[PDB]
Every structure is written in C-alpha cells, then in structure tokens.
Design a binder for this molecule. Structure first.
Ligand code: HEM
Ligand code: HEM
Ligand SMILES: [Cl-]
Ligand SMILES: [Cl-]
Ligand SMILES: [Cl-]
Ligand SMILES: [Cl-]
Ligand SMILES: [Cl-]
Ligand SMILES: [Cl-]
Ligand SMILES: [Cl-]
Ligand SMILES: [Cl-]
Ligand SMILES: [Cl-]
Ligand code: NA
Ligand code: NA
Ligand code: NA
Ligand code: NA
Ligand code: NA
Ligand code: NA
Ligand code: NA
Ligand code: NA
Lengths: 355, 352
C-alpha cells in the first residue's frame, strides 16, 4: 500500500471532508485552568504533537507511550472544536474571547424525544480522532489527553467503528443499512463550500472552519432485529441490501418522495430542503447495566457551516414524527465550532487565542 | 476465500489460530431447564458459526434472518470459540442437565473480583480482523440464544500487530507474546494447550480458557520512568529483549532481571501457557476521571491446576506489575474439542 497519511496543515482541518476512516475516538474536555496562556500552550503543544502523530534519559518517563511504534499512521486525523462553554460559562465570559465568539455556537434546542445525559454532551473542547486502526486512534487520543492533564479534565470519551464495503460500498450502520448515501461528494469543493465550510461572515479563525454537531444515539438492536424487513425498510425509505430508494433500481438514483412513507427517516430529512455532511460511527458499549440489554448505537457526527439553518430544522422535523424514533433514543448532544485549518508554523486556534 | 479460518476440525478455531485484531468476549447463563433446549442451541450455533466463518429469497414480511451489517465485508479470519464454566454442570448443588458425571477434572473457579464480570455457564470468544465483523458474529449468535440463555456480560478488545510481523504491543507499549511457543509447532501445542488425557472424552482435543479482566493504570504508567517500566517486566521496551541480551527472541537469563519482575516470576514457575490476550478501553474511570483501559487476558492450557494456578500464585504476591494493574474479573472455561462436519459443538458432552 501507499503511505496512509492525511495532511494535517492546510486551509481546513482534516477529519471533516477527509475520507471516512474505520475507527474513531471522540473526547470532550473542560478547561479548568483560568488563564488563556495555559490554553495557548495547550494548543501549540497539541499542534506539534498532532503534526508528529499524523505524519535518552532512562530515569525519565518515555515521551511517547509506545503502543503504535510498529503501526502505520492509518490515515490518522485529529479534529479540534470549541463548545459554547469555552466562550461563556456560569454567566461569565472566559479568556476574553467575546469579540471572537462564533455566530451559531450555542447548545442545541431541547427536543421532546430527548433523554439527554448532560455528562454525555457539551464540553469546552472536543477532539475527534480517526484512523483505520483502533490502536492507532487510541494511541493518538491518549497522548493528546496526556498533554492536557493540568489544564483540562476529560468530560467523556466515546469510541466507535464503521466498516466500509470490501469493494468500496457505502458503509452500513448497526441496523444493516447503507449509511452516507445522501451526502454530497466530499471531493466536490463547490458542494463542500456550500454545505460545510464557513467562507465569510464569521471571525477569521472560523473561516475555513465548520460547526460539528454531536448526537449519541442509542439503537434498540433487539427489537429492530425482531422487526420485519418491510418495517425496517419502511423506517428509512430505502431497500436494505441495495440501499436504493423505493421505486428505484440503484442506491444513487434520486429519492422519489411520493414513493416512501412521509414519516420515514429519509423523507423527513429530505423534506427540510437542508443539507449537512454526516460522518457518523457506530458504537457498542457492552450491556446496559440497568436493563441488561445491549448498549449500542450511533455516534452521530455531522458538519455544517450554519447549524441554525441546516441542522436544527432537521432535528425539529425528525424529533416530531420520525419512524426511526421507535428504534432510537438520543442520550447525548453537543455543538462545537471547529476552527479553520492550521498553517505550518502556526498553531491550532491561534487566530482565536492570540492577542 | 483467503481470510477464512476453518470452523470444523480436530480443535476449535481461535486458540492456536493466528491472533486477530479484534475480539468480542461474551458470557451467557443458561435459563432453559430441559437439556433438549441446550442441544438445539448448540446445533443451531454450529450451523450459524459455520455460515458466519465461511463467508456465505426470504419473505420481506418476516424478520431478516441475518442482521445485515457484515454483508459487504470480508470474513476477516473470523473465529468463534465456545467454552463451559463450572456452573454449566452444577449450580447451587443441583446437577442441572445430568452432566455433572461428565464435568471436566480441573474446572473450578480460580482461587482468590467482580462476579458480574466473570463466571457464566457458556463463554463465546469471537475474533476477527475487523471489529464490525466480530460484533456481527456475536450479535447473530446471541440472537439465536434468546429464550434459552441470558447474556451475562460482553467485553470487547483489540490488539494490532506490527505491519512487519512484529510482536504486538499492549497498552503499556511492550511487546506481548514473546514467551509463547510457536502456535505452528504441533508437538508443543499438544504439550501445552491440547487435552488428550485425563478428562471426559468430549474434552479431548479441547483445552481450558482462563479469562482475566485486568485494569491497567495508564495515567500513572505514562508518568513512570522508562527504567521503572522495564524493571517491571525484565525486558527492554523497544527491542523486547531480556535484560543483558540483544534480541527479543534471545533466551531469558533470570540472573539478569529482577526477581520480582513479571517475566521472572512467571517463567520461574517452570510452567507454560498459551496467551492470546487483547487490549481494551471503556471510557473514563469515574473514581479517578482518567481512562478506563486494560487487558482482556485470555490464556489456554491443558491443565490450569498444573500450568496456570502456579503462575497466579507467584504473581499475586510479588509481581511488580501489580503496582500498575488491578484484576477486575476472572473466569475459567472448559473448551470442547473441535467439531467434525456433520456434528455439533459439544455433541459428545450433550448426547451422552
Ligand atoms: C441512530 C440514528 C440514525 C440512523 C441509524 C440513521 C440512518 C440513516 C440511513 C440508513 C439513511 C439513508 C441512507 C443515507 O442517505 O445515508 C439516512 C439518511 C439521512 N439521515 Fe440519518 N440516521 C440517524 C440519525 C440521523 C439524524 C439525527 C439526522 C439529522 C439530525 C440524520 C440526517 C440524515 C440525512 C440528512 C440523511 C440524507 C437524506 C437525503 O437523502 O437527503 N440522521 N440516515
Ligand atoms: C495487564 C496484565 C498483563 C500485562 C500488561 C502483561 C504483559 C506481559 C509482557 C510485556 C510480557 C513479556 C513479553 C512476553 O513474553 O509476552 C509477559 C510475559 C508473560 N506473562 Fe504477562 N501480562 C499481563 C498479565 C499476565 C497474567 C495475569 C499472567 C498469568 C497469570 C501472565 C503470564 C505471563 C507469562 C507466562 C509470560 C511469559 C513468561 C516467560 O517468558 O516464560 N501475564 N506479559
Ligand atoms: Cl501536513
Ligand atoms: Cl466516558
Ligand atoms: Cl477532500
Ligand atoms: Cl459562509
Ligand atoms: Cl464500554
Ligand atoms: Cl461492546
Ligand atoms: Cl450565517
Ligand atoms: Cl485509572
Ligand atoms: Cl526463554
Ligand atoms: Na436523492
Ligand atoms: Na454447586
Ligand atoms: Na457488559
Ligand atoms: Na521500535
Ligand atoms: Na473507550
Ligand atoms: Na494483576
Ligand atoms: Na471433539
Ligand atoms: Na471435519
């Protein structure tokens, strides 16, 4: 194989329109330090380390933890984002960043379907670590988090997986359906600018950036597995094996809305007329300690340049009447502003944090 | 089809099979009360495992027989290994299905742990080079067992070997596996792993599986000196060589390593096992707010009383590794010998 490296420095952060890797570690952190200088050091230390990750005194602790020494970089990417709590917490503006706060960075509105665990969402800082090998992804996250002890406390850490098809087929979620068809092509720069990338109207540090929505969505695999193929397909409006819209021959044929249930998932999301870039991963977390049922679902991640215009209307349309709600439950939620890309020589979020 | 491991044979796959990258490890309790339900369970598991591992119409108004998420994936060297805990033969004094007369001779819970994190009547170890493939296999196996078993726990894990065939590294960053004999050396695996005498005949060609869920304190480990890390094991970190030797594969000179090092204590027992462990991570430790991670320690041995319990004894008292680890769960399972095509897993035990 060729080198499995994704460029870290550029106009954009990697991990967004980068091709979807197989594994993710997703962590949220809260800043406990009270001085912006500590955060500056964090982000320049994170930048140098991430550049190393993505590319003699025995009485001292090893600088690196060592468990990816013999492994390929496996298309490792690290994406950083800022939560609303980074800018304002407990009624006070932090670190003097009011002038630089993004337009659309607020917590997502409360939906009635939600069973949100506050500790499973939010966070001042998110770190999305993706690679085609789970040990590589964990190694990257662990070394990054090792730098933040002293400055931050980790809020939560999730991990997930999503295997694309052997022949390049659209990857399937835990319900067995191709997941990602409705995305536009990430190699179409024009469409990514219109959907994902902030181009103007925001602070300089957010230009070339995007907003990341995070929803941890439990999936009721047991009752889904007892449901008929027809019910499963009716839930989505696509046929399970082909991923083709109802009444169509191929996965990539256009959805015909008059042929699918109006409460189906695809119909409702298509109804808004809005677009986002989904980049989710499945998770399994053993058995629910309470119910003794399998804990599994979707780490739903999507990017959009304007979440108020593109993402909240989807939540509203789905939270109302989505057939998928029978089989899912949102238990975690967060929104993060992902900075524009980093130039070599500079550090992540330098335009935001620097005086 | 290249990434296919044979399911039928003299032995169960997943033991001397080359170590795959991902594991799901489940324990089930039998809730059915009639032995005929257990036989159909194992017959159906045998057919389904044969389908799942080999790669390989129905009406849309019925539930799909398969859950679908591995449809476009390679078999990925999927193996599925079955074992029985002591409770499968007697629980609370009762002989449950007339099987106690066929109980294995060394199947007693390991002497002193979270009990919800060990035990069980049945274990299933599912290994594949792709995590989605392994979950799909376990999920469909567990779906077949509803009504007859309840799932006790599910752990999962990972262990990536080097691209250059290098020995895989655990989460402390040390090569892990060097002390194992070659799993391709049939005579050595016969001597260490495979049962051919001293057990009921369904155990012939089988083995005992030891499972230990061992928490690894990564935060304090990563803050410990490289010399302290090496002194813990008695091998150098990058090369994996025993102290005083050049190569990973050089013999261990016990005079050159601390008497309380992990390698010294285990080797000086004179005993040997076949270790086939996987790393794990499971979110944050709430008591400390640091990463909850560890080793899913899995070993195979023909006689745990002779080969494994001596190691547990020597390490539990004096191992320097105990400073950085804590055992959270423990179980011992008896794995049946292999299944011949036409038969079913544990037929010789269940048919009587
Ligand atoms: C466990 C939760 C979810 C599952 C299993 C799921 C699965 C799917 C599937 C199978 C499709 C059809 C194939 C595709 O185009 O990818 C789809 C489409 C889509 N879903 Fe989801 N989804 C989930 C949650 C969400 C949420 C929370 C949102 C938005 C708030 C969302 C937005 C969309 C969009 C925008 C599409 C493409 C619609 C189009 O064709 O234009 N999904 N999803
Ligand atoms: C988190 C827990 C553990 C870790 C991190 C760990 C790691 C290691 C490492 C790095 C080595 C040296 C390289 C090798 O030969 O593989 C080793 C050797 C070994 N370990 Fe462990 N191990 C753990 C638990 C255990 C347990 C619980 C046992 C037995 C009850 C055990 C038995 C052995 C044996 C038999 C050897 C080979 C000794 C020889 O050279 O003859 N290990 N282990
Ligand atoms: Cl670069
Ligand atoms: Cl967590
Ligand atoms: Cl691209
Ligand atoms: Cl814009
Ligand atoms: Cl977990
Ligand atoms: Cl799991
Ligand atoms: Cl705007
Ligand atoms: Cl800890
Ligand atoms: Cl040796
Ligand atoms: Na369409
Ligand atoms: Na008993
Ligand atoms: Na569990
Ligand atoms: Na090395
Ligand atoms: Na984890
Ligand atoms: Na231990
Ligand atoms: Na046999
Ligand atoms: Na055979």
């Amino acid at each position: 194989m060729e080198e499995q490296i994704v460029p870290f420095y550029g106009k954009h952060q990697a991990g967004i329109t980068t091709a979807h890797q197989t594994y993710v570690y997703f962590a949220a952190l809260d800043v406990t330090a009270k001085e912006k200088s500590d955060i500056i050091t964090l982000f320049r230390n994170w930048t140098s380390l991430t550049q190393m990750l993505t590319s003699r005194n025995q009485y001292l602790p090893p600088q690196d933890t060592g468990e990816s020494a013999d492994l390929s970089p496996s298309n490792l990417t690290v994406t950083f984002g800022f939560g609303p709590s980074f800018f304002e917490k407990d009624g006070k503006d932090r670190f003097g960043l009011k002038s630089k706060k993004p337009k659309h960075l607020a917590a997502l509105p409360a939906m009635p379907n939600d069973n949100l665990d506050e500790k499973q969402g939010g966070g001042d800082i998110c770190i999305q670590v993706c690679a085609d090998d789970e040990q590589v992804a964990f190694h990257a996250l662990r070394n990054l988090l090792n730098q933040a002890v002293g400055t931050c406390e980790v809020r939560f850490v999730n991990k997930g997986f999503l295997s694309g098809g052997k022949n390049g087929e659209t990857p399937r979620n835990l319900f067995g359906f191709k997941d990602g068809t409705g995305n536009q092509s990430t190699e179409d720069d024009s469409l990514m600018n219109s959907i994902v990338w902030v181009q103007s109207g925001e602070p300089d540090w957010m230009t070339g950036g995007t907003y990341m929505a995070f929803r941890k969505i439990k999936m009721f695999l047991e009752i889904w597995d007892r449901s008929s193929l027809k019910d499963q397909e009716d839930t989505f409006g696509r046929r399970k094996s082909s991923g083709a819209p109802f009444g169509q021959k191929k996965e990539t044929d256009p959805v015909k809305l008059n042929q699918i249930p109006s409460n189906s998932h695809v119909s409702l999301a298509k109804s808004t007329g809005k677009q986002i870039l989904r980049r989710a991963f499945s998770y399994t977390e053993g058995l629910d300690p309470k119910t003794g049922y399998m804990d599994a679902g979707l780490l739903f991640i999507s990017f959009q340049k304007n979440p108020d215009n593109q993402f909240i209307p989807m939540l509203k349309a789905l939270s109302a009447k989505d057939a998928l709600n029978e089989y899912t439950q949102t238990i975690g939620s967060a929104l993060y502003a992902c900075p524009g890309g980093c130039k070599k020589g500079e550090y992540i979020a330098q335009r935001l944090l620097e005086s």
